[PDB]
Amino acid sequence: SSRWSKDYDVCVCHSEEDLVAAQDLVSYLEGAIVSELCQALSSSHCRVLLITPGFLQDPWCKYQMLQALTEAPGAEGCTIPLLLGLSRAAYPPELRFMYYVDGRGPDGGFRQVKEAVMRYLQTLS
Amino acid sequence: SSRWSKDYDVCVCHSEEDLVAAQDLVSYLEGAIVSELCQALSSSHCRVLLITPGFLQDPWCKYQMLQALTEAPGAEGCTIPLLLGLSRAAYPPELRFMYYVDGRGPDGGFRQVKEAVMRYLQTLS
């Protein structure tokens, strides 16, 4: 629960083809919010899932999403799914019962995502 | 870890339109393996996910799948996804990195599923 229990505040889980957008989000989150692109050995307080068409195809990404929710948002963890470049129809059905940020929101969804991260951080010692 | 820590050995998580098949599996599992159709207040050792086209659409089903894996198969729990009436292409990408039973297997996938349940049960006190 300690704000320093993790070395990063938020990391972005993005597919290979979405590299640029991921970085744009990291910059946005920086500007304090410490952020990076999620690595395997990566461990932060919040994990933003850059869910794009590419992310949904890559079987490893999906598995990552699944494990990112394995132990996550149930009030215990912080996982923020950002939906970009996808008709709301293509959206993963399970999202109708979970928190997520629509890319059509203000600042391509970035603002609401930062706010989401920001909120969780405060609940920390 | 006690075989009696749960009242049922296995319950089947099936969509509304797959009611019949679900029951067929329950009968198969019975014939000792205690089994039922998963309810909300349902709690068993193993949970078989009857993943069919219908199950994948129903947003509640997907959420159920997600939560059925939230705390599950990582060596700790027992969740068995059975894929029926779906071209392997439609299969949830995350499955390429997880255990599952193909409906094209012997006994419409039922045999391998019973074996899966059976195996987990023995690892119990």
Query: Mind spelling out the 3-state secondary structure of A9-32?
Result: EEEEECCHHHHHHHHHHHHHHHCC
Report which residue type is found at B7. D
List the one residue out of A123, A103, A85 whose CA is nearest residue A28.
Answer: A103
With CB atoms and an 8 Å threshold, state whether A93 touches B65. Answer: no
Question: Which alpha helices (DSSP H) does A1-125 contain, by range?
Answer: 19-30, 53-57, 59-70, 110-122
How far is the C-alpha of B103 from the C-alpha of A92, rounded, in Å? 23
With CB atoms and an 8 Å threshold, state whether A93 touches B56. Answer: yes
Tokens standing for residue B90: 């439609």
Method: X-ray
**With the C-alpha atoms ordered B44, B46, B52, B55, is the resulting torsion angle positive or negative?**
positive
- Does B94 contact chain A (CB < 8 Å)? yes
Q: Give chain A's domains with CATH numbers.
A: 1-125 (3.40.50.10140)
Tokens standing for residue B106: 């012997």
Tokens standing for residue B77: 């729990």
List the one residue out of B31, B34, B40 whose CA is nearest residue B5.
Answer: B34
Q: Residue A122 in 3-state DSSP?
A: helix
Please tell me the number of Cα atoms within 13 Å of A41 on its side-chain side: 0
Closest Cα in chain B to A72: B70
